[PDB]
Design a protein around this ligand. Structure first.
Ligand SMILES: Cc1cc2nc3c(=O)[nH]c(=O)nc-3n(C[C@H](O)[C@H](O)[C@H](O)COP(=O)(O)OP(=O)(O)OC[C@H]3O[C@@H](n4cnc5c(N)ncnc54)[C@H](O)[C@@H]3O)c2cc1C
Ligand SMILES: *[C@@H]1O[C@H](CO)[C@@H](O[C@@H]2O[C@H](CO)[C@@H](O)[C@H](O)[C@H]2NC(C)=O)[C@H](O)[C@H]1NC(C)=O
Ligand SMILES: *[C@@H]1O[C@H](CO)[C@@H](O)[C@H](O)[C@H]1NC(C)=O
Length: 572
């Protein structure tokens, strides 16, 4: 049976009549022949400068990118760039690249069954997308048939008391739940949680999918320190296997599959629905806004980075005190970042469940450590109190930031013991700060600790062990030009993987990274992404998808195949 999937233009590729008959079986209009988002910017039959300008204007918008079957928030390889003609830009070339060639706009189980079956029947690579949010190309594939789940939406329903499809009691959970009965986004789930005065533990941005890559890789957000990571919210799922069977996965049934999807990434089956734990609303949340800038701005920014190193050392104490959230910093920035300075550190942290007085005590270990820098840095610190989770969430989080660039980042979970020696930390900070000429994004995800640590007791979970000891994640990355030569991308990828990523590993060598926002070019990605759970993830992969119908890049088992950006996917 053939080692390589069939691709367009080959003799094995179904001819126009076969595709047309497949469109008609589905329901005319469901099969979409994909077109590069910005093809109207280029010469040929599809050229349209009005369409091109609209596309150029809307490229950075998350909804615009989720609305097209091959729209990508963080496109893995821009092979058809939008062209800004008003700005004097001119076209190079436009190809599909590694984006799927056909998509099925699937809105019923029958759509999904037929798409799965057709892919297998014609040996065509099946690509699964709920939203196209992925940063690593795991919802892409050259010459692929995309199962697009964006309109597969059969309700989001609140359960006052979790009620399992197979009456499983082994979760031990008798609290409330939400049945996410479709490939909904967090926005949709949040509306129902809010209507029912409960906390749904979703992402900091509401556009990503609720039941796909987000929970399967981990899933962080404002509420995860307090209530657990996204993967650990999952009580059960309905999943269509490669063989077409629809099965329940929970503590009582196919528990190896259930564990795999809760931390082992995508590619075990097509997730049709999940049930998630939801949590009682709180009476208070206080947010802490901190900003730090140099009094004396220089290319080295020695004092700023000293303080950032110190701040990193304070995070575990903060985490132990119920503090969570996100911090952002730059050694150099192309313009004012903190007040008047073209550099600095800023964060939005919070104590869910605590009023301001307790919030101030919670961050005291950090503010006290920062008193030593009052002569050297300008530091501002404010608190905002909210009377429930949702007013807090929408005020301090619920982000819809600009997107549309390639992601080249590395992530490293940091254990407390990696931070006790200031000099080692300072050295890590020096390297990840990057070259003063090159913009380096550095981000702190203070999203673990607390309940995430506690949920180590849950052996049904598949989450990377390092989550259970690491209260926060460091992410460091750089951009590439929109139209990027191979040489420039290899230079940047090397800085991210072997300079930035390497420093982070040296700082914390016993932990790992975060697959969803992580380094897909790391030679050691298996270790980073999955850790010691990998052998068990792989077993589930080989049991439930022996033919690797759900192949994705870096996903468990992907090393048994060779992916190309411009040719057939093949088994080794
Ligand atoms: C603007 C933006 C903001 C973000 N914010 C956050 C954040 O705050 N916190 C955080 O942790 N992450 C965040 N992410 C990252 C997100 O967790 C990952 O990109 C994740 O892969 C998104 O899953 P998705 O289904 O939405 O993406 P997709 O690209 O649709 O799919 C991602 C992967 O999951 C697979 N997949 C999707 N749906 C299914 C399914 N139903 N069954 C089987 N496999 C499936 C795909 O095959 C692919 O491998 C953000 C991403 C974007 C674009
Ligand atoms: C982005 O897409 C381009 C175009 O498909 C890829 O370039 C090809 O890469 C292979 C090696 O992997 C070469 O043998 C081809 O000659 C390249 N083609 C062209 C037209 O340049 C590129 O590899 C993709 N980048 C990534 C990181 O996936
Ligand atoms: C996808 O299908 C739904 C109906 O199931 C329809 O409302 C929607 O507009 C379709 N989208 C596209 C892009 O064809």
């Amino acid at each position: 049976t053939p080692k390589c999937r069939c691709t367009p233009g080959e003799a094995c590729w179904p001819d126009n009549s076969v595709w047309e008959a497949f469109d008609k079986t589905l329901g005319k209009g469901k099969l979409i022949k994909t077109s590069p988002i910005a093809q109207s910017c280029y010469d040929g039959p599809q050229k349209d400068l009005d369409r091109c300008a609209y596309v150029n204007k809307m490229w950075t918008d998350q909804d615009f990118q989720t609305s097209d079957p091959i729209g990508r928030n963080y496109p893995y390889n821009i092979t058809c760039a939008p062209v800004d003609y008003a700005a004097g830009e001119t076209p190079t070339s436009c190809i599909l690249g590694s984006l799927p060639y056909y998509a099925v706009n699937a809105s019923t189980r029958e759509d999904i069954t037929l798409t799965l079956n057709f892919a297998k029947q014609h040996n065509i690579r099946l690509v699964t997308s709920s939203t196209g949010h992925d940063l690593l190309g795991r919802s892409d594939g050259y010459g692929g048939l995309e199962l697009w789940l964006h309109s597969f939406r059969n309700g989001v329903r609140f359960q006052k008391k979790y009620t399992s499809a197979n009456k499983c009691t082994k979760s031990g959970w008798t609290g409330s739940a939400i049945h996410i009965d479709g490939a909904y986004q967090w926005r949709d789930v949040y509306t129902v949680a809010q209507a029912n005065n409960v906390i749904a533990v979703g992402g900091g941005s509401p556009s990503p999918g609720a039941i796909g890559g987000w929970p399967s890789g981990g899933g962080h957000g404002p509420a995860t320190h307090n209530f657990g990571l996204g993967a650990d919210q999952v009580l059960e799922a309905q999943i269509m296997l490669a063989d077409g069977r629809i099965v329940t996965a929970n503590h009582c049934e196919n528990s190896d599959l259930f564990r795999a999807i809760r931390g082992g990434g995508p590619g075990y089956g097509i997730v049709l629905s999940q049930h998630i734990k939801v949590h009682p609303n709180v009476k208070a949340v206080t947010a802490h806004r901190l900003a730090i800038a140099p009094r004396n701005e220089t290319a080295e920014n020695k004092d700023l980075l000293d303080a950032i190193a110190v701040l990193h050392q304070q995070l575990p104490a903060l985490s132990n005190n119920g503090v969570a959230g996100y911090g952002f910093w730059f050694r150099s920035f192309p313009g004012p970042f903190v007040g008047d300075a073209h550099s600095g550190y800023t964060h939005g942290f919070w104590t869910i469940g605590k009023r301001q007085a307790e919030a101030e005590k919670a961050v005291a270990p950090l503010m006290n450590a920062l008193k030593k820098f009052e002569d050297k840095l300008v530091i501002t610190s404010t608190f905002a109190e909210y009377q429930d989770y949702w007013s807090f969430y929408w005020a301090e989080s619920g982000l819809h930031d600009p997107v549309g660039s390639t992601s080249i980042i590395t992530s490293r979970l940091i254990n407390p013991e990696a931070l006790t020696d200031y000099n080692k930390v300072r050295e890590a900070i020096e390297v990840v700060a990057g070259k003063p000429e090159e913009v380096s994004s550095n981000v702190v995800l203070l999203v673990s600790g607390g309940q995430v640590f506690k949920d180590k007791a849950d052996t049904s979970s598949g989450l990377h062990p390092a989550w259970r000891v690491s209260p926060f994640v460091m992410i460091s990355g750089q951009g590439i030009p929109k139209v990027a030569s191979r040489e420039i991308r290899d230079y940047v990828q090397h800085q991210v993987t072997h300079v930035k990523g390497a420093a982070l590993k040296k700082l914390a060598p016993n932990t790992g990274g975060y697959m969803n926002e992580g380094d897909g070019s790391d030679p050691e990605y298996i270790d980073a992404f999955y850790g010691k759970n990998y052998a068990q993830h792989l077993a589930a992969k080989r049991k439930y998808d022996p033919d690797n119908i759900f192949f994705c890049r870096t996903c468990v088992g992907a090393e048994d195949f060779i992916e190309r950006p411009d040719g057939p996917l093949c088994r080794k």
